[PDB]
Amino acid sequence: MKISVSKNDLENALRYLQAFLDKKDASSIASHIHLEVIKEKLFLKASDSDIGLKSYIFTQSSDKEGVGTINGKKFLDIISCLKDSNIILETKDDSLAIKQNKSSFKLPMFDADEFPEFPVIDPKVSIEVNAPFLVDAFKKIAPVIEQTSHKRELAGILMQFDQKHQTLSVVGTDTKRLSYTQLEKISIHSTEEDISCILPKRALLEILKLFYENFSFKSDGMLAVIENEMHTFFTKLIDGNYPDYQKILPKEYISSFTLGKEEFKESIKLCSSLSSTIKLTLEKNNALFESLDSEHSETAKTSVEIEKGLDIEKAFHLGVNAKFFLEALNALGTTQFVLRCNEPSSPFLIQESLDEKQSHLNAKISTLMMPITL
Amino acid sequence: MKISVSKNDLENALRYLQAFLDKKDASSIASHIHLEVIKEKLFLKASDSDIGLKSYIFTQSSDKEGVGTINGKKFLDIISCLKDSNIILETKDDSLAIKQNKSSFKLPMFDADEFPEFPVIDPKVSIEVNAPFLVDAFKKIAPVIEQTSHKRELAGILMQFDQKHQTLSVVGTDTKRLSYTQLEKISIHSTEEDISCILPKRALLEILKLFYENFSFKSDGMLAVIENEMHTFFTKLIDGNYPDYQKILPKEYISSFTLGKEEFKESIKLCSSLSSTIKLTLEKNNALFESLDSEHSETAKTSVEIEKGLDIEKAFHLGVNAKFFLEALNALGTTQFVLRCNEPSSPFLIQESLDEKQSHLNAKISTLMMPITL
């Protein structure tokens, strides 16, 4: 191999690749990036059986095509310390040479034959995503998902494709709370009418660093592959059946209150200084907040005026987990939110104001939560 | 007690005080701030036998004078979540009430009689510091000092007062390296001709957060007390005898090179990607840097042109610790530095260009380092 590349292009590519290396044992090929020069591109890839990323940068020049490998962490450590001028990469036996003017380095290469095959799939389902709605859904739902969940299928995010109705549902839950969204008017190409993909949390978080809009998503029911012009990402899927979240959603709600998002965030954080649970009291023109599981002798109270009177003929009391409530509000894009309730011992829902209104660019996430008793 | 205070004044005061609390066991008075209302001031103090801070803020109003205590971490957690409007603090039995409009809190107080006495000293030495030179010296020397040093006196920074010559010397060492500065034309008031104070590293780091210029420093040989208009800080001193650093400094140096600071930093970091030690080669118009304790098959080299020829008739080779060398350069305020050497196996010195030149506002730190063999 012998090429020259842009320092900043290379550094950026290496930064993305770090998350796909097992970096602690540098003597293992799992700590290495596979390199391949083909025509005017340098491809860099880091993968294992479970997950992987393949990227390219254009070469500034190319004298010799071929393949090699290099420790990804050391490679980035070197590049990040170099000048903003072009870098020469040239193989020399079992070794990769890096040169930039007066600076030169050598790093040992491993046998590229040991490097894992980067998978290709025969997709059963595919979508083209030309707006931020999918990663918006992912980012909004991620906090509810236990990565190290001890239950397999809940350790990931559900993507449920309905080809007939052209809707993709995105769901996360940790059994105390459940966040979901339904994305309509999605052009879904699928061999089956319905197909469900469960992406592991790690994959979710990596996707958020790599992608935003204008990418494809494809799956063969075993792997999911996401591609744009620069990147091809894959992840193994979680096998099994995600619980049907629809069966747990209440059919109707006795009461629905339209409330101020930022005032509630501010009030909940305030009581959270002394407790993890909060007693919320709703009156016609007031919202009261009191610390609930605070130590004896420690109390926090606050209230907020509600100018547009709630349909309440007598105080409604609701015990809530402060962190969950806050996270549900963080997932909302509107200045107001709707709190839908039945009995105080029953699950309640938090969602955007005008959730029913059609949106193009964004996902609207709703969160269903179990209350605290008393 | 009953007063009102400014939220931002209070929050700022509480932030400074956090470092002086043992925060993990909230049931201990060590986690508490002592409060005292005297006339139009609120004094807040956190201290133990070893170290402490006493601060004040002016009250916006004062209805009732008295004393109390409160958990400092909870207090700050509450205040930081409040609005930017005045806060009412009022004692109610064994409890402190905090009110801001619709928000109200209660926290339990402890018996103020258990709170440790804040010490006053009869100073044996005192200085008034009206320029940043002392904290500049402290900040520059701090990195060489082992806080958790297993040797008592080296676990702190030395302040050596010479009343006769009106000089204060500031020294830190960890036995591999030694950084020092001599501050001249300091008005020293002292009962003894010579007196040495050793401040613990923790105290050093706290001082850096609190003080910059226009403060007094006093010591009775047991405690050191630092005061400005807002703060009174104290620390117990480390007992014993700091080694005389003067006896270890070489008398003369065979060679002294004036070199580029930022070029050396950049070159050393570059080789540091692959090693912790570096072989430096000085020639008449070139400085060469090579990784030294890098793994087999991993190498890093770079060089820098030296336009103003060094007085060198044949290459000088010096083995150096990369981190120490970098830290010595970080402590310098000039664009160039002087490297003074004897034999390659002998200690060498790093200091500012024109170190001998008189400076008002700043400390000039020199670092003496043991080289690496080969």
Numbering used by the authors:
A (entry chain A), B (entry chain A): 1 to 374
What does the paper say about this structure?
The sliding clamp is a ring-shaped protein complex that encircles DNA with the help of clamp loader in an ATP-dependent manner, and slides along the DNA. Although β-clamp is part of the DNA polymerase III holoenzyme, it is not attached to polymerase III permanently like the other subunits. β-clamp is loaded on the DNA, by clamp loader, a subunit of DNA Pol III. In both prokaryotes and eukaryotes, a key feature of this clamp-binding motif is the presence of hydrophobic amino acid residues that bind to the hydrophobic pocket in the C-terminal region of the clamp.
However there is no significant difference observed between these two structures from different space groups, the structural alignment of both yielded an RMSD of 0.15 Å. In Hpβ-clamp, domains I, II, and III were observed to span residues Met1to Phe118, Pro119 to Pro 250, and Lys251 to Leu374, respectively. Domain I comprised of nine antiparallel β-strands and two alpha helices, domain II having eight β-strands and two alpha helices, and domain III with eight β-strands and two helices. Two salt bridges are formed between Glu266 and Glu298 of chain A with Lys83 and Lys74 of chain B, and another set of equivalent salt bridges also formed between Glu 266 of chain B and Lys 83 of chain A, and between Glu 298 of chain B and Lys 74 of chain A. These salt bridges and several hydrophobic interactions were observed to mediate the association between the monomers. Perhaps most notably, two major DNA-interacting loops of β-clamp were observed to adopt quite different conformations in H. pylori compared to the β-clamp in E. coli and the other organisms. Despite the oppositely oriented loops, our superposition of Hpβ-clamp with DNA-bound Ecβ-clamp showed the side chain of Hpβ-clamp Lys23 (which corresponds to Arg 24 Ecβ-clamp) still to be in a position close to DNA, suggesting that Lys23 of Hpβ-clamp may participate in DNA binding and may be crucial for binding to DNA.
